[PDB]
Amino acid sequence: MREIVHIQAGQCGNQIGAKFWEVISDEHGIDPTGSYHGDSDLQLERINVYYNEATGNKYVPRAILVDLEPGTMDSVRSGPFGQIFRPDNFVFGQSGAGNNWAKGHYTEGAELVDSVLDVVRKESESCDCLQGFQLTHSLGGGTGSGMGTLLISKIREEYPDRIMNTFSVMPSPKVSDTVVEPYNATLSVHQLVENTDETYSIDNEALYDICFRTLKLTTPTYGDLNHLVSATMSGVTTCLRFPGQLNADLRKLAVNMVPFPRLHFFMPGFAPLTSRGSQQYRALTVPELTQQMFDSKNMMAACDPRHGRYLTVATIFRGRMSMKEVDEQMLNIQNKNSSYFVEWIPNNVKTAVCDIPPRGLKMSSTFIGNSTAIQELFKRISEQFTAMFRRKAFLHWYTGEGMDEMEFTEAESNMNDLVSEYQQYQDATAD
Amino acid sequence: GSDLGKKLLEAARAGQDDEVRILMANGADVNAEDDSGKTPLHLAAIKGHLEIVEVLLKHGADVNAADKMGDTPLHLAALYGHLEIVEVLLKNGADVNATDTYGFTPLHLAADAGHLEIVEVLLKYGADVNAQDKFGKTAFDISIDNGNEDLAEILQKLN
Amino acid sequence: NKATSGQSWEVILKPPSFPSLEEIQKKLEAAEERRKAHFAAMLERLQEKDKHAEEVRKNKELKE
Amino acid sequence: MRECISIHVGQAGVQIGNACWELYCLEHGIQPDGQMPSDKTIGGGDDSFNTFFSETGAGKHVPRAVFVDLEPTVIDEVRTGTYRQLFHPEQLITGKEDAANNYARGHYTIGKEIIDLVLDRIRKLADQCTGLQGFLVFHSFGGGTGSGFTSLLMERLSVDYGKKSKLEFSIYPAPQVSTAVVEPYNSILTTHTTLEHSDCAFMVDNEAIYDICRRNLDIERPTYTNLNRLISQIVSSITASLRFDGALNVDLTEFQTNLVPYPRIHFPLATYAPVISAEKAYHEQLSVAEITNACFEPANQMVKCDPRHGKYMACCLLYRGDVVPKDVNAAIATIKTKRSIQFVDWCPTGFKVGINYQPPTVVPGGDLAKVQRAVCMLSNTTAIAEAWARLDHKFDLMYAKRAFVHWYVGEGMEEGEFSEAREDMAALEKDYEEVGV
Ligand SMILES: Nc1nc2c(ncn2[C@@H]2O[C@H](COP(=O)(O)OP(=O)(O)OP(=O)(O)O)[C@@H](O)[C@H]2O)c(=O)[nH]1
Ligand SMILES: Nc1nc2c(ncn2[C@@H]2O[C@H](COP(=O)(O)OP(=O)(O)O)[C@@H](O)[C@H]2O)c(=O)[nH]1
Ligand SMILES: [Mg+2]
């Protein structure tokens, strides 16, 4: 453990990735030029996990930016922190994926993949001790989805002993109108079940619902959704980038979170929920942070945790607070809600407290749950997939790329087995 | 139509039936276009909001209004599988054979989506089965390439 | 017993009533050969998918 | 002669080692640079502290210790800290990648890469010994290095140092401070593999220490620094007799003779008293009777268990400071009248008593008050089986579902090893039950 290699694929992946880099640079005291201007040795202790130190006291993200479309790369370079990235790390095609998983995975993606692997190999071989990889992408499009999963498989081939981690954005008809999103997401989930060690399920259905219902934003934009994604990504990576005892690296996190290989889809939670530029009046208390953290309304995946059972939970508290109060509040939740935590995994809730709060807040809490309720996300995608597949809708766009109908049948079957497996552990008893 | 135009589009996308009515009375423009050229009628047609479609039409909405991709509300309801909306637009003068920037007719889109009942209503209303999109595909070709046996039988009778 | 920096005694309250090194190498050998066989099976299954993606690409040319 | 090599494995082992060596230095008057005005330069190399500290030509005292970790951060603190001059760089060994709380990874994957280097450094320390007694091994049960690397090391040490004594100071897991859900798996896997290689093991239950810190030291949320300072006091009580001219537990073999009647039942229970807060108002010092009584109170134990639900097979009382035999004997007599100190049929009902005149020592700005007299009772009771039962139950809950098993199997471990380890624990619980039935 030390270095993490970050990969950003497609429009969503690059937008969410760029936001992650600007948020974490601010936390680590790094400005858009790569210079450290912070005021705390804690900010630099584990800087090497995400940044390479270049000549002249500059810090460079260990990030690879990928797209089959050039426009997104221009948007990244033009962004606030756009100048911090390594120019040789931008790997882009000229003809997009046209929101087609098959084009991203087999055709256009395959044509670009080796150029990407050459850049990831250069970053990986420069590592003193590589933890693994972190990929940001959507499952609904063509590049992030198809090419992103192709990259995962190609990387798994060359680095079989490293951890593969993803921030996978799940499609929703509430935010996108592309009819093929159920096909692209099911084909990707099939790949993720087999090839990743840990996946953060970032659901556009839940992000939209939070913005509309809680934040009272009549017309949520990707900027509003991405404000919730970046808060979450900062929270779930806190333990990796600051000194601490719990889930300090990708493997220790996986060992604590993943009891069965296929069951590696996490339901992230965050408190307090805020809107871009909302003037947050008074910091929350520890009982308020704990109550909200397990609340369905604070979940970044559109699943009710009360509809399932927690296999494992990681809770991260940020800011200056009593560790005694956190311990009491955390024990109270488990004792009161005993039935929503599997009895056959003792002490399955792990808590960490980081003194450094995120930007704009004095106190915050991040929840990472491995809940059997995530089956609701997969069932929603499966039902949308089946409605289309049963009518043989839009199939020619996929088969036209050389794919067979059987791949669709197989992907659907694998996702339904995953749902069945969650249900099996939901019903299992310590007997 | 300023504040009212954006508010009317929001209410037709959300299916806020009573908020659409309140905005019409206040003078919101029925054909107020969005970023993509979509009128409140295209949004009601995508999302499946039958009553909104009917209130918009009674308040003189443009049934054949084309967005920036050249899709009318009939192309959208046909793609999204809203049979009852496809029947309402047709009865109110929707262009069965309207063509977008890609050469797609509503039949092209219903065949690709596999909407059997929509294809039947489109053919009943005079959809041309010999129309070719910019890919050189008829709706029969679309069903054969998709592997759709039931739909290719439904279209072969004319083609 | 009286030592320089210490003292000791007993208090009896009551009487009673009335080279394996080669095997270590063999066990570590087995685990290593099993871990490699696990990794090699993951690799064959990914090498299997690579063949399928080259098959998909050759099928694309059969259309246009 | 008669040297003891201390081996600190993983974070818990290294951190407890820091606390122990800091305390030893205060006890012997050794400064953090290795200098001591009390000694003579060889000389000068025959006083009891020499069993734990070697001497250099510059008159410096060097711990006969090796610190090992599969990751560098914890040991990096030792090589940059207050005692950086106390240890030579070669005795601080680190890898790059840790065992990720996985016994299989610590034992089979990563451990295999550093084992020869560790044995080479241990061998260089042993080469400086004329009468090596054996090893004191400090490690956690829960971590992948503490569990996996320790058992690998213990096996090799039995090969390289034949009939040489090996004692353990093992950190038993507590959820209040636990970092891994898999700690019960690692605990049972290490106990099974180390069992035939360890002669005597002193378990330290993190919850017992956590509770003593909260109750006796008034610490709201105890940290590893608080836990370790308290742990070091008990370790110092146990090792005082090796490092000073004792009379009881004079050598490593004597711990076995005095506390272990059967090789498998080798887990003595340590009970320490008094544990008093430094930030407290002037109070009258506890008598020999009061501290002896405190030895039979479950609240003062290093492992949570009930001796009233078990039987004693050996009992050692290690007094320190202003202690007179007359007061000890009177205290033992009164205890039998108020307490059920039931021994097994085959063992005599009694105590082996040792007074070490050296005063109890505390770290200056620490949590513990300096006392005139203290005592550590080491007893081999069947009640300690309760700690194995709690661990075995947590193992069984997860194992019935094969939860997390894929992590060990992926490192080359066989599922049958989990069964073998668990059956050995079931035989151990059966041994405790059968002994004193
Ligand atoms: N008392 C005490 N317990 C500790 C300390 N550090 C860790 N532990 C406990 O030991 C267990 C974790 O094992 P570690 O020693 O940290 O792990 P490790 O041996 O370094 O192994 P890996 O990190 O997995 O390679 C948990 O039960 C912790 O509570 C310490 O300084 N003191
Ligand atoms: N949360 C979020 N979702 C996005 C963003 N951009 C696109 N999406 C979603 O991503 C999916 C479309 O995939 P996209 O990444 O744009 O296509 P790609 O460029 O082919 O990978 C849909 O579900 C969109 O709603 C963004 O900035 N944030
Ligand atoms: Mg460690």
PDB file of N, CA and C in Angstrom, chain D residues 110-182:
ATOM      1  N   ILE D 110       3.045 -12.482   1.999  1.00  0.00           N
ATOM      2  CA  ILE D 110       4.035 -11.450   2.299  1.00  0.00           C
ATOM      3  C   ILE D 110       5.115 -11.931   3.239  1.00  0.00           C
ATOM      4  N   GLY D 111       4.710 -12.657   4.276  1.00  0.00           N
ATOM      5  CA  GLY D 111       5.615 -13.197   5.282  1.00  0.00           C
ATOM      6  C   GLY D 111       6.811 -13.940   4.725  1.00  0.00           C
ATOM      7  N   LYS D 112       6.571 -14.800   3.701  1.00  0.00           N
ATOM      8  CA  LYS D 112       7.567 -15.606   2.963  1.00  0.00           C
ATOM      9  C   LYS D 112       8.712 -14.767   2.363  1.00  0.00           C
ATOM     10  N   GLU D 113       8.443 -13.485   2.080  1.00  0.00           N
ATOM     11  CA  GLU D 113       9.389 -12.540   1.482  1.00  0.00           C
ATOM     12  C   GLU D 113      10.396 -11.927   2.454  1.00  0.00           C
ATOM     13  N   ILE D 114      10.024 -11.808   3.740  1.00  0.00           N
ATOM     14  CA  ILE D 114      10.841 -11.157   4.765  1.00  0.00           C
ATOM     15  C   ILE D 114      11.383 -12.120   5.843  1.00  0.00           C
ATOM     16  N   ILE D 115      10.852 -13.354   5.926  1.00  0.00           N
ATOM     17  CA  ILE D 115      11.238 -14.333   6.933  1.00  0.00           C
ATOM     18  C   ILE D 115      12.745 -14.577   7.087  1.00  0.00           C
ATOM     19  N   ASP D 116      13.468 -14.785   5.972  1.00  0.00           N
ATOM     20  CA  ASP D 116      14.911 -15.035   6.004  1.00  0.00           C
ATOM     21  C   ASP D 116      15.711 -13.846   6.524  1.00  0.00           C
ATOM     22  N   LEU D 117      15.318 -12.623   6.134  1.00  0.00           N
ATOM     23  CA  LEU D 117      15.900 -11.370   6.602  1.00  0.00           C
ATOM     24  C   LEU D 117      15.684 -11.199   8.130  1.00  0.00           C
ATOM     25  N   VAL D 118      14.463 -11.502   8.652  1.00  0.00           N
ATOM     26  CA  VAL D 118      14.155 -11.410  10.090  1.00  0.00           C
ATOM     27  C   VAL D 118      15.006 -12.384  10.869  1.00  0.00           C
ATOM     28  N   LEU D 119      15.077 -13.658  10.400  1.00  0.00           N
ATOM     29  CA  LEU D 119      15.883 -14.696  11.051  1.00  0.00           C
ATOM     30  C   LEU D 119      17.346 -14.342  11.033  1.00  0.00           C
ATOM     31  N   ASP D 120      17.805 -13.636   9.987  1.00  0.00           N
ATOM     32  CA  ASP D 120      19.199 -13.200   9.883  1.00  0.00           C
ATOM     33  C   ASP D 120      19.509 -12.138  10.946  1.00  0.00           C
ATOM     34  N   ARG D 121      18.574 -11.216  11.184  1.00  0.00           N
ATOM     35  CA  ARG D 121      18.746 -10.218  12.233  1.00  0.00           C
ATOM     36  C   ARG D 121      18.643 -10.767  13.660  1.00  0.00           C
ATOM     37  N   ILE D 122      17.771 -11.760  13.844  1.00  0.00           N
ATOM     38  CA  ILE D 122      17.619 -12.450  15.121  1.00  0.00           C
ATOM     39  C   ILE D 122      18.940 -13.192  15.386  1.00  0.00           C
ATOM     40  N   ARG D 123      19.481 -13.869  14.345  1.00  0.00           N
ATOM     41  CA  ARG D 123      20.719 -14.637  14.418  1.00  0.00           C
ATOM     42  C   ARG D 123      21.901 -13.749  14.813  1.00  0.00           C
ATOM     43  N   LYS D 124      21.959 -12.507  14.300  1.00  0.00           N
ATOM     44  CA  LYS D 124      23.028 -11.570  14.622  1.00  0.00           C
ATOM     45  C   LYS D 124      22.967 -11.155  16.100  1.00  0.00           C
ATOM     46  N   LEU D 125      21.743 -11.048  16.669  1.00  0.00           N
ATOM     47  CA  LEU D 125      21.533 -10.753  18.091  1.00  0.00           C
ATOM     48  C   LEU D 125      21.921 -11.980  18.937  1.00  0.00           C
ATOM     49  N   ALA D 126      21.545 -13.198  18.477  1.00  0.00           N
ATOM     50  CA  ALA D 126      21.846 -14.447  19.162  1.00  0.00           C
ATOM     51  C   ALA D 126      23.356 -14.705  19.193  1.00  0.00           C
ATOM     52  N   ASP D 127      24.092 -14.263  18.151  1.00  0.00           N
ATOM     53  CA  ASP D 127      25.553 -14.388  18.061  1.00  0.00           C
ATOM     54  C   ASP D 127      26.283 -13.613  19.172  1.00  0.00           C
ATOM     55  N   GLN D 128      25.640 -12.565  19.707  1.00  0.00           N
ATOM     56  CA  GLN D 128      26.142 -11.722  20.802  1.00  0.00           C
ATOM     57  C   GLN D 128      25.783 -12.306  22.200  1.00  0.00           C
ATOM     58  N   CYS D 129      25.072 -13.461  22.233  1.00  0.00           N
ATOM     59  CA  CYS D 129      24.630 -14.124  23.462  1.00  0.00           C
ATOM     60  C   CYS D 129      25.544 -15.288  23.768  1.00  0.00           C
ATOM     61  N   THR D 130      25.857 -15.491  25.042  1.00  0.00           N
ATOM     62  CA  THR D 130      26.714 -16.597  25.450  1.00  0.00           C
ATOM     63  C   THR D 130      25.850 -17.697  26.097  1.00  0.00           C
ATOM     64  N   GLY D 131      24.646 -17.326  26.538  1.00  0.00           N
ATOM     65  CA  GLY D 131      23.709 -18.237  27.178  1.00  0.00           C
ATOM     66  C   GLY D 131      22.271 -17.874  26.923  1.00  0.00           C
ATOM     67  N   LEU D 132      21.921 -17.778  25.623  1.00  0.00           N
ATOM     68  CA  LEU D 132      20.568 -17.434  25.189  1.00  0.00           C
ATOM     69  C   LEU D 132      19.477 -18.329  25.855  1.00  0.00           C
ATOM     70  N   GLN D 133      18.576 -17.707  26.644  1.00  0.00           N
ATOM     71  CA  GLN D 133      17.468 -18.378  27.336  1.00  0.00           C
ATOM     72  C   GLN D 133      16.348 -18.672  26.340  1.00  0.00           C
ATOM     73  N   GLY D 134      16.133 -17.738  25.428  1.00  0.00           N
ATOM     74  CA  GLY D 134      15.072 -17.807  24.438  1.00  0.00           C
ATOM     75  C   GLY D 134      14.467 -16.469  24.071  1.00  0.00           C
ATOM     76  N   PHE D 135      13.169 -16.497  23.686  1.00  0.00           N
ATOM     77  CA  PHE D 135      12.430 -15.371  23.119  1.00  0.00           C
ATOM     78  C   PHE D 135      11.140 -14.944  23.822  1.00  0.00           C
ATOM     79  N   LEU D 136      10.901 -13.635  23.839  1.00  0.00           N
ATOM     80  CA  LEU D 136       9.665 -12.992  24.297  1.00  0.00           C
ATOM     81  C   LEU D 136       9.057 -12.379  23.023  1.00  0.00           C
ATOM     82  N   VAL D 137       7.882 -12.879  22.597  1.00  0.00           N
ATOM     83  CA  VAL D 137       7.249 -12.459  21.347  1.00  0.00           C
ATOM     84  C   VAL D 137       5.986 -11.674  21.623  1.00  0.00           C
ATOM     85  N   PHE D 138       5.956 -10.401  21.170  1.00  0.00           N
ATOM     86  CA  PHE D 138       4.834  -9.463  21.344  1.00  0.00           C
ATOM     87  C   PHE D 138       4.088  -9.287  20.032  1.00  0.00           C
ATOM     88  N   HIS D 139       2.779  -9.559  20.025  1.00  0.00           N
ATOM     89  CA  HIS D 139       1.975  -9.450  18.804  1.00  0.00           C
ATOM     90  C   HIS D 139       0.476  -9.410  19.105  1.00  0.00           C
ATOM     91  N   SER D 140      -0.325  -8.941  18.146  1.00  0.00           N
ATOM     92  CA  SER D 140      -1.782  -8.982  18.263  1.00  0.00           C
ATOM     93  C   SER D 140      -2.243 -10.311  17.660  1.00  0.00           C
ATOM     94  N   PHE D 141      -3.417 -10.761  18.038  1.00  0.00           N
ATOM     95  CA  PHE D 141      -4.065 -11.922  17.446  1.00  0.00           C
ATOM     96  C   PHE D 141      -4.788 -11.473  16.163  1.00  0.00           C
ATOM     97  N   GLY D 142      -5.315 -10.245  16.194  1.00  0.00           N
ATOM     98  CA  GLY D 142      -6.179  -9.687  15.173  1.00  0.00           C
ATOM     99  C   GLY D 142      -5.623  -9.262  13.837  1.00  0.00           C
ATOM    100  N   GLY D 143      -4.423  -8.687  13.824  1.00  0.00           N
ATOM    101  CA  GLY D 143      -3.832  -8.197  12.585  1.00  0.00           C
ATOM    102  C   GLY D 143      -3.284  -9.318  11.741  1.00  0.00           C
ATOM    103  N   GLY D 144      -3.134  -9.102  10.446  1.00  0.00           N
ATOM    104  CA  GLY D 144      -2.565 -10.114   9.563  1.00  0.00           C
ATOM    105  C   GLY D 144      -1.084 -10.369   9.797  1.00  0.00           C
ATOM    106  N   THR D 145      -0.297  -9.326  10.201  1.00  0.00           N
ATOM    107  CA  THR D 145       1.129  -9.507  10.493  1.00  0.00           C
ATOM    108  C   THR D 145       1.265 -10.142  11.872  1.00  0.00           C
ATOM    109  N   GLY D 146       0.630  -9.524  12.877  1.00  0.00           N
ATOM    110  CA  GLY D 146       0.623 -10.025  14.243  1.00  0.00           C
ATOM    111  C   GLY D 146       0.182 -11.475  14.308  1.00  0.00           C
ATOM    112  N   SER D 147      -0.823 -11.889  13.499  1.00  0.00           N
ATOM    113  CA  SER D 147      -1.283 -13.277  13.494  1.00  0.00           C
ATOM    114  C   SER D 147      -0.463 -14.162  12.540  1.00  0.00           C
ATOM    115  N   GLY D 148      -0.476 -13.817  11.243  1.00  0.00           N
ATOM    116  CA  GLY D 148       0.180 -14.569  10.172  1.00  0.00           C
ATOM    117  C   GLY D 148       1.687 -14.637  10.222  1.00  0.00           C
ATOM    118  N   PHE D 149       2.355 -13.485  10.398  1.00  0.00           N
ATOM    119  CA  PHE D 149       3.809 -13.486  10.455  1.00  0.00           C
ATOM    120  C   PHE D 149       4.334 -14.145  11.727  1.00  0.00           C
ATOM    121  N   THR D 150       3.671 -13.906  12.879  1.00  0.00           N
ATOM    122  CA  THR D 150       4.078 -14.497  14.162  1.00  0.00           C
ATOM    123  C   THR D 150       4.136 -16.018  14.117  1.00  0.00           C
ATOM    124  N   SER D 151       3.064 -16.676  13.638  1.00  0.00           N
ATOM    125  CA  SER D 151       3.034 -18.129  13.579  1.00  0.00           C
ATOM    126  C   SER D 151       4.120 -18.698  12.635  1.00  0.00           C
ATOM    127  N   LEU D 152       4.385 -18.015  11.513  1.00  0.00           N
ATOM    128  CA  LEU D 152       5.447 -18.389  10.583  1.00  0.00           C
ATOM    129  C   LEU D 152       6.824 -18.294  11.306  1.00  0.00           C
ATOM    130  N   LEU D 153       7.044 -17.180  12.029  1.00  0.00           N
ATOM    131  CA  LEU D 153       8.255 -16.939  12.797  1.00  0.00           C
ATOM    132  C   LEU D 153       8.433 -17.962  13.912  1.00  0.00           C
ATOM    133  N   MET D 154       7.365 -18.262  14.699  1.00  0.00           N
ATOM    134  CA  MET D 154       7.411 -19.214  15.805  1.00  0.00           C
ATOM    135  C   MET D 154       7.841 -20.600  15.351  1.00  0.00           C
ATOM    136  N   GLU D 155       7.320 -21.080  14.197  1.00  0.00           N
ATOM    137  CA  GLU D 155       7.676 -22.378  13.597  1.00  0.00           C
ATOM    138  C   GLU D 155       9.167 -22.448  13.285  1.00  0.00           C
ATOM    139  N   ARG D 156       9.709 -21.397  12.623  1.00  0.00           N
ATOM    140  CA  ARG D 156      11.113 -21.296  12.217  1.00  0.00           C
ATOM    141  C   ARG D 156      12.030 -21.180  13.421  1.00  0.00           C
ATOM    142  N   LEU D 157      11.571 -20.489  14.471  1.00  0.00           N
ATOM    143  CA  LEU D 157      12.367 -20.346  15.673  1.00  0.00           C
ATOM    144  C   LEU D 157      12.519 -21.675  16.385  1.00  0.00           C
ATOM    145  N   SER D 158      11.491 -22.554  16.334  1.00  0.00           N
ATOM    146  CA  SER D 158      11.546 -23.900  16.923  1.00  0.00           C
ATOM    147  C   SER D 158      12.585 -24.768  16.174  1.00  0.00           C
ATOM    148  N   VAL D 159      12.700 -24.553  14.844  1.00  0.00           N
ATOM    149  CA  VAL D 159      13.655 -25.245  13.979  1.00  0.00           C
ATOM    150  C   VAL D 159      15.093 -24.770  14.278  1.00  0.00           C
ATOM    151  N   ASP D 160      15.343 -23.444  14.214  1.00  0.00           N
ATOM    152  CA  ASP D 160      16.662 -22.829  14.416  1.00  0.00           C
ATOM    153  C   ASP D 160      17.174 -22.792  15.836  1.00  0.00           C
ATOM    154  N   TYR D 161      16.257 -22.764  16.826  1.00  0.00           N
ATOM    155  CA  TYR D 161      16.611 -22.684  18.240  1.00  0.00           C
ATOM    156  C   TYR D 161      15.908 -23.770  19.007  1.00  0.00           C
ATOM    157  N   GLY D 162      16.225 -25.013  18.646  1.00  0.00           N
ATOM    158  CA  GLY D 162      15.669 -26.232  19.210  1.00  0.00           C
ATOM    159  C   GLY D 162      14.801 -26.127  20.444  1.00  0.00           C
ATOM    160  N   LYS D 163      15.378 -26.507  21.560  1.00  0.00           N
ATOM    161  CA  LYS D 163      14.705 -26.608  22.838  1.00  0.00           C
ATOM    162  C   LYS D 163      14.852 -25.284  23.596  1.00  0.00           C
ATOM    163  N   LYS D 164      14.638 -24.159  22.914  1.00  0.00           N
ATOM    164  CA  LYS D 164      14.766 -22.819  23.480  1.00  0.00           C
ATOM    165  C   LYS D 164      13.392 -22.247  23.761  1.00  0.00           C
ATOM    166  N   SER D 165      13.200 -21.751  24.984  1.00  0.00           N
ATOM    167  CA  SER D 165      11.958 -21.170  25.480  1.00  0.00           C
ATOM    168  C   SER D 165      11.409 -19.997  24.670  1.00  0.00           C
ATOM    169  N   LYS D 166      10.105 -20.003  24.461  1.00  0.00           N
ATOM    170  CA  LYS D 166       9.396 -18.956  23.736  1.00  0.00           C
ATOM    171  C   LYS D 166       8.139 -18.580  24.500  1.00  0.00           C
ATOM    172  N   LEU D 167       8.112 -17.328  24.959  1.00  0.00           N
ATOM    173  CA  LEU D 167       6.954 -16.801  25.668  1.00  0.00           C
ATOM    174  C   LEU D 167       6.297 -15.732  24.817  1.00  0.00           C
ATOM    175  N   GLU D 168       4.969 -15.599  24.938  1.00  0.00           N
ATOM    176  CA  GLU D 168       4.196 -14.636  24.173  1.00  0.00           C
ATOM    177  C   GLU D 168       3.469 -13.652  25.049  1.00  0.00           C
ATOM    178  N   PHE D 169       3.302 -12.446  24.513  1.00  0.00           N
ATOM    179  CA  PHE D 169       2.466 -11.387  25.048  1.00  0.00           C
ATOM    180  C   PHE D 169       1.557 -11.099  23.854  1.00  0.00           C
ATOM    181  N   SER D 170       0.367 -11.692  23.893  1.00  0.00           N
ATOM    182  CA  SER D 170      -0.618 -11.663  22.816  1.00  0.00           C
ATOM    183  C   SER D 170      -1.794 -10.730  23.093  1.00  0.00           C
ATOM    184  N   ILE D 171      -2.101  -9.851  22.124  1.00  0.00           N
ATOM    185  CA  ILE D 171      -3.215  -8.909  22.232  1.00  0.00           C
ATOM    186  C   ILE D 171      -4.489  -9.528  21.694  1.00  0.00           C
ATOM    187  N   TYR D 172      -5.382  -9.824  22.630  1.00  0.00           N
ATOM    188  CA  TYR D 172      -6.678 -10.435  22.410  1.00  0.00           C
ATOM    189  C   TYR D 172      -7.644  -9.310  21.965  1.00  0.00           C
ATOM    190  N   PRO D 173      -8.410  -9.541  20.866  1.00  0.00           N
ATOM    191  CA  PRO D 173      -9.243  -8.460  20.300  1.00  0.00           C
ATOM    192  C   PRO D 173     -10.452  -7.996  21.101  1.00  0.00           C
ATOM    193  N   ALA D 174     -10.752  -6.677  21.027  1.00  0.00           N
ATOM    194  CA  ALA D 174     -11.907  -6.029  21.650  1.00  0.00           C
ATOM    195  C   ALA D 174     -12.571  -5.166  20.622  1.00  0.00           C
ATOM    196  N   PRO D 175     -13.916  -5.237  20.471  1.00  0.00           N
ATOM    197  CA  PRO D 175     -14.597  -4.388  19.464  1.00  0.00           C
ATOM    198  C   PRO D 175     -14.451  -2.885  19.647  1.00  0.00           C
ATOM    199  N   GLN D 176     -14.254  -2.403  20.889  1.00  0.00           N
ATOM    200  CA  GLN D 176     -14.064  -0.970  21.174  1.00  0.00           C
ATOM    201  C   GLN D 176     -12.873  -0.402  20.398  1.00  0.00           C
ATOM    202  N   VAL D 177     -11.853  -1.227  20.158  1.00  0.00           N
ATOM    203  CA  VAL D 177     -10.643  -0.816  19.456  1.00  0.00           C
ATOM    204  C   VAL D 177     -10.276  -1.642  18.213  1.00  0.00           C
ATOM    205  N   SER D 178     -11.123  -2.611  17.823  1.00  0.00           N
ATOM    206  CA  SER D 178     -10.907  -3.504  16.672  1.00  0.00           C
ATOM    207  C   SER D 178     -10.882  -2.774  15.340  1.00  0.00           C
ATOM    208  N   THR D 179     -10.042  -3.243  14.418  1.00  0.00           N
ATOM    209  CA  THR D 179      -9.918  -2.641  13.077  1.00  0.00           C
ATOM    210  C   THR D 179     -10.365  -3.575  11.958  1.00  0.00           C
ATOM    211  N   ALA D 180     -10.688  -4.840  12.297  1.00  0.00           N
ATOM    212  CA  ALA D 180     -11.109  -5.828  11.313  1.00  0.00           C
ATOM    213  C   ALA D 180     -12.203  -6.743  11.795  1.00  0.00           C
ATOM    214  N   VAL D 181     -13.179  -6.971  10.927  1.00  0.00           N
ATOM    215  CA  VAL D 181     -14.283  -7.904  11.159  1.00  0.00           C
ATOM    216  C   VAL D 181     -13.707  -9.355  11.245  1.00  0.00           C
ATOM    217  N   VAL D 182     -12.642  -9.640  10.489  1.00  0.00           N
ATOM    218  CA  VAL D 182     -12.008 -10.950  10.456  1.00  0.00           C
ATOM    219  C   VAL D 182     -11.078 -11.297  11.628  1.00  0.00           C
TER     220      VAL D 182
END
